[PDB]
Write a protein that binds this DNA or RNA. Structure first.
Lengths: 398, 250, 224, 136, 69
RNA sequence: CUAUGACUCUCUUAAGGUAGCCAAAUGCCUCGUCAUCUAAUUAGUGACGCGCAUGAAUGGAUCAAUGAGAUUCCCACUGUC
RNA sequence: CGCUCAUAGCGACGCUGCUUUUUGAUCCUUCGAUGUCGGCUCUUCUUAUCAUUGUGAAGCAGAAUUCACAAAGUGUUGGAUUGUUCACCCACUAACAAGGAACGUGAGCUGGGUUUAGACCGUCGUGAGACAGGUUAGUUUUACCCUACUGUUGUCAAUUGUUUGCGUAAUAGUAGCAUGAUUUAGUACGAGAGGAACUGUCAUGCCGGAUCACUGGUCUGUAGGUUUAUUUGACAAAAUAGUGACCUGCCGCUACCAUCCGUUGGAUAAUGGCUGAACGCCUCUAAGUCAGAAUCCAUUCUAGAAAC
């Protein structure tokens, strides 16, 4: 007890410090990309759903490495991105004390997009049911004028407009049919220009292919996978205390000095682990594709022979009865927040990056599939096991 | 049982200790490391300065003071100050904690000094580093002494390695070839460093000098000419060896 | 003649470059100055591949060959092989050998009429090699060593051995190969001859540390 | 020292031999064992053992061999390890035993290397590559 | 590299999976699973093991065609 | 030969440490010195011993077998790391 | 002293300060009780900056080193010996800087020592006993209270009529740091020995945040097999052996034991300059102004206010 350290190199980062459960399950932040890009090529964000992972072999193309052109096995996360319905436009004007919401225009062309809007988007005791409660124009002509006026207002005023968009979760295999709604801020052009584009897109959908490219980087945002109340060892990564075991073990020994008669806001302590927002930036993307259903039968996982035999990117048995990709998906490079069926919002990079691995084009070879539930490549696997037959089962065939 | 504080069991003072044993009783005193030596040299500094404490000890490490009963049984007096003086004068120096460390260092120092004075590598007369010399002296084995002089010990050391190896116990002579313009500076470095002889200076021709220096000094000489001049310097042996140094036996 | 090059400031350039009677293999692991300079000095005729073998920096002493055949290891990639095939015009058998118990470069030194080996290599593999290169392979090793492509650097007109080799052994080698030998060693810090240099009947790429005297000797032996 | 490799340094190859790891000398020298004292290029942490994957330069001492080499800290190279590692290829390689070789401080193996040498090591140290029988 | 045979059995080792193991005798082996590694370690012949494709090969079940797709 | 001090003289207080043993569970100085054991050893062991303040039933020295006694080392084993 | 040369760097004989990381001095608090030492663990703070950033001096040619400023943003190790802080060595390293927080941290631990009773030795003592000498063995109690902190509900008892949706963003926190290799280049520099730099490229250490497609660990999936002892008459199939043991093992969880990812603007300091006086000249400074730090503030990232 002389001092005598020097150091203890700080456990955990304090730029995530409150370490509690996230409020928004989707992911959301104050930040989008900066304004004045190009009008509708920049719609700025989208919302996927993570549908497992696979590995994927590809040819590297960096110079100066051990071998420039050689096969490497990079993992790859696969996220379904069913087309997003735009269903509203929100004027949103700068002020001294922030950017308050000015006026909101909703689409009167389809009311069924609000009958998509079910629960967690409407709780007057709702539960896999919409009782039909949406407040819009039922005045035919008078109401129309109001809408127009509103639109004009949000063109006039020094704004940056955003479009209320939502996902098609009813389309997915998932048990929820309550559509996740996220604003995606429109960039590019004049305010007026933006608004008129937004208005156009009301009745229509937008695809992930329209927003993002297949080689450009993406910032993936979503709440992290839940581990519950965890101890200071798993939560912060402090050393276990000594001994076969003494009167604690999984603890920070000391939580402070005497003279500050309080204990620090900054000192590891067992509370919750893993359900907080975070934003993993610079994910390369490989494919933004769609398999057999639409987008050709040849290009389902790459054309046959070279680029491997033709098949869905679904592994055998789908993605571990935690999904099966059937709407346009998006192969982000290795690992993003959350489990195997969590709504990840995706944002374009806050700054558009032009370094290594942003401008590097990349062409896959093998997107491979499950051999602990089979032997890979589908029908072949089935064939192979057939020959083997069964001695061990829960049936000896006496 | 458990106390709120330590029992306190330290009386260890780190100043120098001068020991004198008489009448079957060891007597010590607290003095400083430098001052004892000074006293024995004959240089005065009063008894106030040389003595750190003016009371006689049995053990300075233990911090056990000598009683009057004991003091009078040995020296024939109970006055402590007087006794201290006596201890300082006739007694021998004893190593405290600090002094033990110094002792360890001392041996290293002696070997470094005594061995590196005069030697050259076998085959021809060339300079060479101290480490090699040390190794050589270890191979044949040598035990340094603080009771003998360093100079005296040097001779002894060389004696061993004159029998074993081919070595140079005397000086050598050099011959440098200096330019007229750039050499003056060089000369002024060399002149107070070592003895200059056969100094032939010319304007139309290059300047020529000859030195008298030990076998290990050649390297030192040659090196300082090159960096000061900023060109190469011609080193030639006037003689491979010459009398005096440790060959005259000082 | 002898030309001093260095691969990323390494004096052992015989392992990163293969010189043969015809054709030349060059390694690439971010060594930009080396790739261009080896094109400027071969015979303004012998092509280069600029291709890694087994994804590895070593190429010069991972492969062995002449003009009638080329040997590659079992671990060599198919893509890589394809490139090699493309780069070598049709007058040579580019065969991936099925020998995994030893390397196809450190354990094989060869010229256009004879070769040297491990005295350990499997029989079948040896036979295959013989078939490929179209040369008499016979089992002999330099003294104190079982590797030959490490400690011997053969050409048609000349050959080297490491400096610890006994005279009798050298004589034997001469008798066998029908090639004049010499005990000179490139660099002079390294025992290996194959490390510091690969050689050819017209040219010779050599290590940076190699002495002026040393290069003369090597030049003489090959008759450059 | 040197290192001159290759051009990065790999493409790391996993902790396998911490310090106090005894391994086979796999080289024509007096050494049979090589006790690993420390590994070159290990900036610390705070109670973390320096470790050597493959092609790590390792300050070592001969625990068992001939006494001309023993009781002497000396430079060596880990040439293959039992702890598996992922390559570019995708495949995980591991070897039958932990093993090193003897070398200069610059990475010059003077003997010839016995047993497999591991591709990573070959890629790294040129001399090692030269003296390998099998790199596979 | 591209698809390879197992060297214990005759399974398809796709380039993202399995384990390579190098012996001191300078021989190498893929291993589709740890299951087969264990067997190898034990010295249980694959000609015993009915799960293996070499068994199927030598007792004629037409398993060589599915190993080359 | 001034080291060593047998020898001699005297005093205290009767005699003045013999054989052995030792930085020993007895040594302040002390982490003594030398060898060995380690990459590195205030540790360990074997030597040396003007031994602060060992030593002969206040028992000295030795020592097989034995030891929930103390210490050091190597092998094996090991989530001790 | 430093060949020359007081102040590149040192600096006598002197003198003036500061600090409380030494040990004393004192006895103010505490003796109806503030658990002493060291270590482990963890956090924060200090600067008297070891490294890294930007700079300026040099006896700074080059490389290397030393001296100083702005800077505490980020790092500052593994070990042998010892209870030891301290010490000393070995090895790594960009560096392995010094410090504080009741000599930080015993209802956090350990208890190695100090520090009770047993015991041994040495010296002392007639003796009981002593020793601030050595040795060996020797109980570490209580949180469920309050606050503090970590997370979790819940009231904003008008959440501004109710329930709800999509947002805002005050305030607080905030993260990336560092290295090696190579190109530059055997070029600059140098008599040679030796031997750079900017940019670019590729990898790595430490840190951080995620994840589980791979590989490895785990296995109550008591999933399948094997097998021991017993029990159900045998077979069969079960049971018991607190999961009988063993082999394989998905789902899951998890590991620098695997994988992915970690931004860019403005404003300053040091300093270097500009225009330019006071002081006809001069001068980076007085008015004014330019570049510019791992700095700062935003951007980004985390939370989301009795705030909208």
């Amino acid at each position: 007890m002389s001092h005598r350290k020097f150091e203890a190199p700080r456990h955990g980062n304090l730029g995530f410090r409150p370490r509690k459960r996230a409020a928004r399950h989707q992911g959301k932040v104050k930040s989008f990309p900066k304004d004045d890009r190009t009008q509708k090529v920049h719609l700025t964000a989208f919302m996927g759903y993570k549908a497992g992972m696979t590995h994927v072999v590809r040819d590297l193309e960096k110079p100066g490495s051990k071998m420039h052109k050689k096969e490497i096995v990079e993992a790859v996360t696969i996220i379904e991105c069913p087309p997003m319905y735009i269903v509203g436009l929100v004027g949103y004007v700068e002020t001294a004390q922030g950017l308050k919401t000015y006026k909101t225009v909703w689409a009167q062309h389809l009311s069924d997009n609000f009958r998509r809007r079910l629960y967690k988007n409407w709780y007057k005791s709702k539960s896999k049911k919409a009782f039909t409660k949406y407040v819009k124009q039922y005045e035919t002509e008078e109401g129309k004028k109001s809408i127009e006026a509103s639109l004009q207002a949000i063109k006039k005023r020094c704004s940056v407009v955003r479009v209320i968009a939502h996902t098609q979760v009813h389309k997915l295999k998932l048990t929820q049919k309550k559509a996740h709604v996220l604003e995606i801020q429109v960039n590019g052009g004049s305010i007026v220009e933006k608004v008129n584009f937004a208005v156009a897109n009301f009745e229509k959908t937008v695809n992930v292919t329209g927003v993002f490219a297949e080689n450009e980087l993406i910032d993936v945002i979503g709440v992290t996978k839940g581990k519950g109340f965890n101890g200071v060892i798993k939560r912060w990564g402090v050393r276990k205390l000594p001994r076969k075991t003494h009167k604690g073990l999984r603890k920070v020994a000391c939580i402070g000095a005497w003279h500050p008669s309080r204990v620090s806001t900054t000192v590891p302590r067992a509370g919750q682990l893993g359900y907080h927002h975070r934003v993993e930036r610079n994910k390369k993307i490989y494919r933004i594709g769609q398999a057999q259903p639409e987008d050709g039968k040849q290009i389902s996982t790459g054309k046959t022979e070279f680029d491997l035999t033709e098949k869905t990117i679904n592994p055998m048995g789908g993605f571990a009865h935690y999904g099966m990709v059937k709407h346009e998906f998006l192969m982000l490079k290795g690992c993003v927040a959350g489990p195997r069926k969590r709504a990840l919002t995706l944002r374009k990079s806050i700054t558009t990056q032009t370094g290594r691995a942003a401008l590097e084009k990349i062409t896959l070879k093998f997107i491979d599939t499950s051999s602990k539930f089979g032997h890979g490549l589908h029908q072949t696997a089935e064939d192979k096991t057939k020959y083997f037959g069964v001695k061990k089962s829960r049936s000896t065939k006496a | 049982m458990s106390i709120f504080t330590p029992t306190n069991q330290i009386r260890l003072t780190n100043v120098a200790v001068v020991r004198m044993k008489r009448a079957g009783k060891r007597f010590e005193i607290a003095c400083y490391k430098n001052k004892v030596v000074g006293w024995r040299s004959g240089v005065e500094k009063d008894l106030d300065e040389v003595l750190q404490t003016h009371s006689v000890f049995v053990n300075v490490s233990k911090g056990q003071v000598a009683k009057k009963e004991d003091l009078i049984s040995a020296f024939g007096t109970d006055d402590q100050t007087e006794i201290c003086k006596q201890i300082l004068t006739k007694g021998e120096v004893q190593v405290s904690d600090k002094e033990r460390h110094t002792q360890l260092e001392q041996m290293f120092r002696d070997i470094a000094t005594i061995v590196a004075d005069k030697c050259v590598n076998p085959e021809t007369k060339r300079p060479y580093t101290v480490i090699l010399i040390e190794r050589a002296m270890k191979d044949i084995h040598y035990s340094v002494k603080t009771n003998k002089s360093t100079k005296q010990q040097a001779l002894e050391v060389i004696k061993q390695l004159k029998e074993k190896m081919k070595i140079e116990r005397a000086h050598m002579r050099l011959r440098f070839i200096l330019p007229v313009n750039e050499g003056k500076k060089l000369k002024e470095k060399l002149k107070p460093l070592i003895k200059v002889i056969e100094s032939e200076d010319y304007g139309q021709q290059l300047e020529i000098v000859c030195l008298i220096d030990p076998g290990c000094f050649r390297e030192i000489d040659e090196l300082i000419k090159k960096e000061t001049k900023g060109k190469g310097s011609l080193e030639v042996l006037n003689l491979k060896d010459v009398e005096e140094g440790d060959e005259k036996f000082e | 003649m002898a030309t001093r090059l260095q691969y990323e400031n390494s004096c052992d350039v015989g392992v990163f470059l293969k010189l043969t009677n015809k054709y030349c293999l060059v390694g690439q692991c971010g060594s930009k100055q080396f790739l261009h300079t080896v094109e400027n000095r071969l015979a303004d005729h012998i092509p280069v591949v600029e291709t890694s073998i087994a994804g590895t920096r070593i190429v010069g002493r991972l492969s062995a060959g002449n003009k009638n055949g080329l040997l590659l290891p079992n671990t060599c990639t198919d893509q890589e092989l394809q490139q090699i095939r493309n780069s070598l015009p049709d007058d040579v058998v580019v065969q991936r050998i099925e020998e995994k118990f030893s390397a196809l470069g450190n354990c094989i030194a060869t010229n256009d009429y004879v070769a040297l080996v491990h005295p350990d290599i499997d029989r079948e593999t040896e036979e295959i090699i013989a078939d490929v290169l179209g040369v008499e392979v016979f089992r002999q090793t330099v003294s104190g060593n079982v590797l030959v492509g490490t400690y011997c650097a053969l050409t048609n007109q000349g050959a080297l051995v490491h400096p610890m080799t006994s005279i009798a052994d050298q004589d034997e080698l001469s008798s066998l190969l029908q090639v004049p030998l010499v005990a000179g060693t490139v660099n002079r810090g390294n025992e290996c001859v194959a490390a510091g240099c690969v050689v050819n009947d017209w040219t010779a790429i050599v290590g940076a540390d190699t002495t002026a005297t040393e290069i003369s000797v090597i030049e003489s032996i090959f008759a450059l | 020292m040197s290192k001159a490799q290759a051009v990065g340094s790999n493409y790391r190859v996993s902790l396998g031999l911490p310090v106090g790891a005894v391994m086979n000398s796999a080289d024509n020298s007096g050494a049979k064992n090589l006790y690993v004292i420390a590994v070159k290029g290990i900036k610390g942490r705070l109670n973390r053992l320096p470790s050597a994957g493959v092609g790590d330069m390792v300050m070592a001492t001969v625990k068992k061999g001939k006494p001309e080499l023993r009781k002497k800290v000396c430079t060596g190279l880990v040439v293959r390890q039992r702890k598996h590692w992922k390559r570019k290829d995708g495949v995980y390689i591991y070897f039958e035993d932990n093993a090193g070789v003897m070398c200069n401080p610059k990475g010059e193996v003077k003997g010839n290397i016995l047993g497999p040498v591991a591709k990573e090591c070959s890629d790294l140290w040129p001399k090692v590559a030269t003296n390998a029988g099998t790199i596979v | 590299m591209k698809t390879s045979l197992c060297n214990y059995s005759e399974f398809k080792i796709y380039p993202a999976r399995g384990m390579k193991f190098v012996r001191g005798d300078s021989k190498v082996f893929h291993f589709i699973n740890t299951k087969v590694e264990s067997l190898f370690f034990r010295k249980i012949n694959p000609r015993d093991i009915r799960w293996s494709m070499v068994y199927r090969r030598i007792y004629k079940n037409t398993t060589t065609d599915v190993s080359a797709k």
